[PDB]
Enzyme design. Structure first.
Site, short mmCIF file in Angstrom:
data_model
loop_
_atom_site.label_atom_id
_atom_site.label_comp_id
_atom_site.label_asym_id
_atom_site.label_seq_id
_atom_site.Cartn_x
_atom_site.Cartn_y
_atom_site.Cartn_z
N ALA A 39 9.98 10.31 0.63
CA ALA A 39 8.55 10.48 0.45
C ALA A 39 7.86 9.27 1.06
O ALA A 39 8.17 8.13 0.70
CB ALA A 39 8.20 10.63 -1.03
N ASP A 40 6.91 9.51 1.96
CA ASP A 40 6.16 8.42 2.57
C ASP A 40 5.22 7.76 1.55
O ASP A 40 5.23 8.12 0.38
CB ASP A 40 5.42 8.93 3.83
N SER A 41 4.45 6.78 1.99
CA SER A 41 3.55 6.04 1.09
C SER A 41 2.50 6.97 0.47
O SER A 41 2.33 7.04 -0.77
CB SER A 41 2.88 4.91 1.87
N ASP A 80 2.75 10.14 0.41
CA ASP A 80 3.45 11.19 -0.33
C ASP A 80 3.75 10.74 -1.76
O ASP A 80 3.60 11.52 -2.70
CB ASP A 80 4.73 11.59 0.40
N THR A 81 4.21 9.50 -1.92
CA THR A 81 4.36 8.86 -3.23
C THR A 81 3.05 8.88 -4.00
O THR A 81 3.04 9.14 -5.21
CB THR A 81 4.85 7.42 -3.07
#
Ligand SMILES: CCCCCCCCCCCCCCCCCC(=O)OC[C@H](CO[C@@H]1O[C@H](CO[C@H]2O[C@H](CO)[C@H](O)[C@H](O)[C@H]2O)[C@H](O)[C@H](O)[C@H]1O)OC(=O)CCCCCCCCCCCCCCCCC
Ligand SMILES: CCCCCCCCCCCCCCCCCC(=O)OC[C@H](CO[C@@H]1O[C@H](CO[C@H]2O[C@H](CO)[C@H](O)[C@H](O)[C@H]2O)[C@H](O)[C@H](O)[C@H]1O)OC(=O)CCCCCCCCCCCCCCCCC
Ligand SMILES: CCCCCCCCCCCCCCCCCC(=O)OC[C@H](CO[C@@H]1O[C@H](CO)[C@H](O)[C@H](O)[C@H]1O)OC(=O)CCCCCCCCCCCCCCCCC
Ligand SMILES: CCCCCCCCCCCCCCCCCC(=O)OC[C@H](CO[C@@H]1O[C@H](CO)[C@H](O)[C@H](O)[C@H]1O)OC(=O)CCCCCCCCCCCCCCCCC
Ligand SMILES: CCCCCCCCCCCCCCCC(=O)OC[C@H](CO[C@@H]1O[C@H](CS(=O)(=O)O)[C@@H](O)[C@H](O)[C@H]1O)OC(=O)CCCCCCCCCCCCCCC
Lengths: 85, 185, 97, 176, 49, 85
Positions: free
Chosen positions: F38-40, F42-43
C-alpha cells in the site's frame, strides 16, 4: 391479452411503498432520534416557549392592539380617550 | 506571585455542548441509532451511550445555550415548526435525503483531502529540491476532521513550498465559541 | 440640501396641486397613480430628465376638472396598481374561500 | 506581516500568526478597516461635496479604532466590549448599505439608486463573520431576563419566587 | 433514557406496558425525601407526563 | 474500557485486506502495510476506511507512526476504549 393498461395497480403501488417506508425499525430509530432532539431543544429553550405561549399575545401584543384600536375607534373626547379606557 | 511556570490559561465555561459520542467529526452522517463501536466494547461498560444523551441534553447544559435573546425567540418558531408543525413522515423523507447528500459530500471531501495530500507532496518537493516527497498523514486526518483553520492551511502550504518540513505542523484550531451580543443573540 | 442631509430610505414627499401642476406642465412627471377612497391623492412618478430624477411624490388636490387636460395634454400616463394578475389572484382567493 | 507579535517568514517558527499573542485575531483587521474607512470617507467628501461620506466615515472609523484598542488584550471585559462594539459598527454599516444606501451614490433612475451591497458592505460583513467565527463569547451573562417558564422546574424556591414576583405574578400559589 | 426517548417520540403511547422494580436500601432517616419517588417524579417532570 | 482487541484486530485485518485486494490470511498482525505494498496515499485511504468502519476519530498525532496491523488495531482499540467517557 394485456390487462396491464390503465395502471391502477401502479398508482396504488406508490401508496403501498409509502406505507412500507414506515412501520420499520429505521422509522422507529428516526422517531427515537427526533424524540432525543425534541428533548434537547425543549431543555435548551425553556424561556422562548413561555414567551410564545403566555407572554407574546396576552401581555405584549393584545394590550397594544386593544389600546390602539380603542383610540382609533372612539371620538376625540376626554372621557372616551382617557377616563373610560 | 504564585506563577506556576506555564502562564495561567483561564478556563472559561463551555459555550457549546460537547459533540455527541456517536459523532464522526468528518462530515459523514452518523449512524442511525447505535454508533457501531459498542460491539467492539464490553457490555455494561457501554453505559456511556445514554450517559451522553444525559449531560448532552438534560443535566450538563451550558448556560450559554440557555440564554434568552431575540434571535433565539425567532429560532424557537423555526424549531417548533420543524418538530410539532411538520409531520414526522415528511421529516423522515427529508432526513433520508439529507443523509444521502451528506454521504455524497463526504465522499467529495475525502477525494479532495487525498488530492490535497498529492499537492502536499508536490509542494514539499518544490522547496526541498527532490529529497522530501512524502506527505503528513496526521495532517491528512486533520484536514479530514476539519481541525485546521484556513490560516493554518495556508501557513503549512507556504512552509512546504519554501522549506519542506512535512512533519512540522501548524497548531490545531480551537473550537469556535458561541457568539453572544447582549439581548440580540 | 442633498449634499448636507444623510440618506434616510425613500419616503414619498408630500407636494401640493400647484407644485404638481408646475412639474407636469414643465414635463417632469412621467406617470400618475390616483389613490384614496375619495381618489383625491396622487402618486407622481417623475422621469429621469426631471431635476432630481425618478422620485415617487405624493400630491393632494381639490376636485378640479382640469387635471386630465394637463396630464394627457402634456405627457402623463394615468395608471392603477391593480393589474390582471392581481385580479386573477383575487379570483383565486375567492375560489379558495 | 509583522502584526500581533513577531514574524519569521519561511525560515523558523512558520506558524507564528496562530500563536496566542494576547490580542484578538481581528485587531489589525478592524484597525485597517478603520483606517481605510476614514481615508475613503475624507477622500469621497473632498471629491464630491457630500457630507455623509465624512460623517459616516471618520465617525465610524473612530469607533472601530477604539474597538481595536480595546481588543489589544482580548482576555478581559474591555476585549469583549471591543469585539462587540466592532461587530455593532460593522453590522450598522452593512445594514445602512443594504437598506438605505449611500447619499453620494444617489442617481437619477430608481433602478440606478439601488442600495445594493458594494465593497464597503462586503468588507464590513466579512469583518462581522470574522468576529463571529473567531471569538465573541464573553459578556454572555447579559441577556433577556429569565422567564417564569425557566424556573418552573428549578429546584430553588427562592429563585422561582423571585422570578414570579418580578414578572408580575407574585401571589400565585407555588405548591412546591 | 430509553423511557424518556420513547415518551418524547410518542412511541410510549403505543408501547407494551411494563413493570420495573426499584431498590433504594433502607438508610434514610425517617422520610427525608425518598430517592425512588424523587427519581420517578423527575422522570415525569422532565417528560411532562 | 475493556475493548475486545481480538475482534478489533480481526475487523482491522478485514478492512485492510478488503481495501487492498489480499485475503484475510495475508493480513497478519505483525505484517507491515509496506509489505502489502500500500502506497502512502493508500495507507491514508486505509486509515480513512478504518475510521468509517469503526465510526471513531483516529488519533491524528501518531498516524504517521502506524506501521504494523497490530499497531493499527492497538491504536484503534485504544480509541474505542477512550470514546466512552
Ligand atoms: C424511499 C422514499 C422516497 C423519498 C426519499 C428520498 C428522496 C427525496 C428526499 C427529500 C427531497 C430532497 C432532500 C435534499 C435536501 C434536504 C432538505 C432539507 O431542507 O433538509 C431537511 C432537514 C434534515 O433532517 C434533519 O436534519 C437535522 C439538521 O441537520 C441539517 O439540517 C439542515 C438540512 O437542511 C441544515 O442544512 C443544517 O445545516 C444541517 O445540520 C438533523 O441533522 C438530521 O439530519 C434530521 O433530523 O430537516 C429539516 O430540518 C426540515 C424538515 C422539513 C423539510 C421537508 C423537505 C422535503 C420534504 C419532502 C416531502 C414530500 C413527500 C413525498 C416523498 C418524496 C420526497 C421528495
Ligand atoms: C471575502 C471578502 C473580503 C472583503 C473584500 C472587500 C474589501 C475592499 C476594501 C473596502 C473598499 O473598497 O472600500 C473603499 C473605501 C470606502 O470608504 C468608505 O466609503 C463608504 C461609501 O462607499 C461606497 O462608495 C465608494 C465610492 O464612493 C465605493 O463605491 C464603495 O464601494 C461604496 O460602498 C462610506 O460612506 C465612507 O465614504 C467611507 O468610510 O474607500 C477607499 O478608497 C479606502 C482606501 C484608502 C487608503 C487607506
Ligand atoms: C481591508 C480590511 C478588512 C476588510 C475585510 C477583510 C476580511 C477580514 C476577515 C479575515 C480574518 C482572518 C483572521 O483573523 O485570521 C486569524 C484567525 C485566528 O485563528 C483562530 O483564532 C481562534 C480565536 O482564538 C482560535 O485560536 C483558533 O484556534 C485559531 O485558529 O485564523 C483563521 O483563519 C481562523 C478562521 C477565520 C474566520 C473566518 C474568516 C472571515 C472572512 C470569511 C467570511 C465570509 C463571509 C462573507 C459574508
Ligand atoms: C488590509 C491590511 C491587513 C492587515 C491585517 C494582517 C496584517 C498583520 C496582522 C497579523 O500579523 O496577523 C495576525 C492575526 C492572528 O492573530 C493572532 O491569532 C491568534 C490565533 O489564536 C491569537 O488569537 C492571537 O491572540 C492573535 O494575535 O492573523 C490574521 O488575522 C491575518 C493573517 C493572514 C490572513 C490573511 C492574509 C493577509 C495578507 C496581508 C498581510 C500579511
Ligand atoms: C446577525 C444575527 C446573527 C444571529 C446569531 C448567529 C449565530 C448564533 C448561534 O450560535 O447560532 C445557533 C443557532 C441556534 O440558536 C440557539 O438555539 C438554541 C436552542 S436549539 O439549538 O434550536 O435546540 C438556544 O438554546 C440558544 O440560546 C440559541 O442561541 O443554530 C443555528 O442553527 C444557526 C442558524 C441561523 C444562523
Amino acid at each position: 391479452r394485456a390487462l396491464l393498461l390503465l395502471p391502477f395497480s401502479a398508482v396504488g403501488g406508490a401508496v403501498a411503498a409509502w406505507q412500507g417506508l414506515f412501520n420499520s425499525q429505521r422509522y422507529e430509530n428516526f422517531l427515537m432520534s427526533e424524540g432525543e432532539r425534541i428533548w434537547a431543544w425543549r431543555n435548551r429553550s425553556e424561556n422562548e416557549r413561555w414567551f410564545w405561549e403566555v407572554f407574546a399575545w396576552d401581555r405584549l401584543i393584545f394590550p397594544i392592539l386593544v389600546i390602539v384600536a380603542w383610540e382609533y375607534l372612539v371620538p376625540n373626547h376626554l372621557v372616551w380617550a382617557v377616563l373610560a379606557p | 506571585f504564585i506563577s506556576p511556570m506555564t502562564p495561567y490559561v483561564p478556563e472559561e465555561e463551555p459555550t457549546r455542548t460537547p459533540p455527541s459520542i456517536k459523532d464522526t467529526g468528518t462530515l459523514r452522517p452518523a449512524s442511525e441509532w447505535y454508533p457501531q463501536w459498542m460491539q467492539y466494547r464490553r457490555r455494561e461498560d457501554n453505559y456511556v451511550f445514554w450517559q451522553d444523551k444525559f449531560m448532552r441534553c438534560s443535566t450538563d447544559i451550558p448556560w450559554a445555550e440557555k440564554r434568552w435573546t431575540l434571535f433565539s425567540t425567532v429560532w424557537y418558531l423555526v424549531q417548533q415548526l420543524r418538530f410539532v408543525g411538520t409531520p414526522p413522515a415528511l421529516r423522515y423523507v427529508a432526513f433520508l435525503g439529507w443523509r444521502a447528500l451528506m454521504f455524497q459530500v463526504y465522499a467529495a471531501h475525502k477525494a479532495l483531502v487525498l488530492w490535497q495530500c498529492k499537492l502536499d507532496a508536490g509542494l514539499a518537493r518544490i522547496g526541498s529540491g527532490g529529497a522530501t516527497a512524502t506527505f503528513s498523514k496526521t495532517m491528512a486526518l486533520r484536514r479530514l476532521h476539519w481541525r485546521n483553520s484556513p490560516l493554518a492551511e495556508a501557513l503549512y502550504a507556504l512552509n512546504l513550498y519554501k522549506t519542506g518540513r512535512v512533519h512540522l505542523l501548524p497548531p490545531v484550531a480551537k473550537p469556535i465559541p458561541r457568539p453572544t451580543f447582549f439581548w440580540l443573540f | 440640501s442633498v449634499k448636507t442631509a444623510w440618506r434616510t430610505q425613500e419616503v414619498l414627499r408630500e407636494l401640493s396641486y400647484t407644485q404638481l401642476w408646475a412639474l407636469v406642465g414643465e414635463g417632469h412627471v412621467a406617470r400618475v397613480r390616483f389613490y384614496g377612497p375619495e381618489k383625491n391623492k396622487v402618486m407622481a412618478t417623475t422621469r429621469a430628465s426631471a431635476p432630481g430624477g425618478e422620485r415617487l411624490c405624493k400630491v393632494v388636490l381639490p376636485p378640479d376638472p382640469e387635471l386630465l387636460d394637463h396630464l394627457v395634454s402634456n405627457g402623463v400616463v394615468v395608471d392603477t396598481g391593480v393589474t390582471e394578475d392581481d385580479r386573477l389572484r383575487a379570483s383565486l382567493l375567492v375560489q379558495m374561500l | 506581516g509583522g502584526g500581533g507579535g513577531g514574524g519569521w517568514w519561511r525560515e523558523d517558527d512558520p506558524y507564528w500568526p496562530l500563536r496566542d499573542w494576547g490580542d484578538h485575531p481581528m485587531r489589525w483587521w478592524t484597525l485597517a478597516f478603520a483606517a481605510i474607512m476614514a481615508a475613503g470617507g475624507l477622500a469621497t467628501s473632498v471629491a464630491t461635496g457630500y457630507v455623509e461620506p465624512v460623517q459616516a466615515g471618520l465617525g465610524a472609523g473612530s469607533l472601530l479604532a477604539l474597538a481595536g484598542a480595546a481588543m489589544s488584550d482580548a482576555r478581559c471585559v474591555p476585549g469583549a466590549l471591543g469585539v462587540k462594539l466592532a461587530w455593532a459598527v460593522c453590522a450598522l454599516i452593512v445594514l445602512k448599505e443594504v437598506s438605505v444606501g449611500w447619499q453620494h451614490k444617489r442617481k437619477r433612475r430608481l433602478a440606478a439608486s439601488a442600495p445594493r451591497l458594494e465593497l464597503t458592505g462586503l468588507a464590513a460583513a466579512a469583518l462581522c463573520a470574522g468576529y463571529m467565527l473567531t471569538d465573541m463569547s464573553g459578556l454572555g451573562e447579559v441577556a433577556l431576563p429569565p422567564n417564569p417558564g425557566a424556573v418552573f422546574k428549578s429546584p430553588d424556591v427562592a429563585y422561582r419566587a423571585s422570578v414570579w414576583q418580578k414578572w408580575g405574578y407574585g401571589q400565585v400559589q407555588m405548591r412546591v | 433514557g430509553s423511557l424518556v426517548c420513547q415518551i418524547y417520540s410518542g412511541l410510549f403511547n403505543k408501547q407494551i406496558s411494563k413493570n420495573i422494580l426499584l431498590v433504594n436500601p433502607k438508610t434514610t432517616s425517617n422520610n427525608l425525601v425518598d430517592y425512588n419517588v424523587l427519581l420517578i417524579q423527575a422522570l415525569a417532570g422532565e417528560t411532562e407526563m | 474500557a475493556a475493548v475486545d482487541k481480538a475482534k478489533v484486530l480481526e475487523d482491522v485485518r478485514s478492512i485492510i485486506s478488503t481495501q487492498l485486494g489480499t485475503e484475510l490470511e495475508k493480513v497478519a498482525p505483525e505484517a507491515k502495510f509496506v509489505d502489502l505494498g500500500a502506497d502512502s496515499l493508500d495507507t491514508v485511504e486505509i486509515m480513512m476506511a478504518l475510521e468509517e468502519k469503526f465510526e471513531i476519530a483516529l488519533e491524528e498525532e501518531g498516524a504517521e507512526k502506524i506501521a504494523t496491523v497490530q499497531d493499527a488495531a492497538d491504536m484503534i482499540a485504544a480509541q474505542i476504549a477512550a470514546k466512552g467517557n
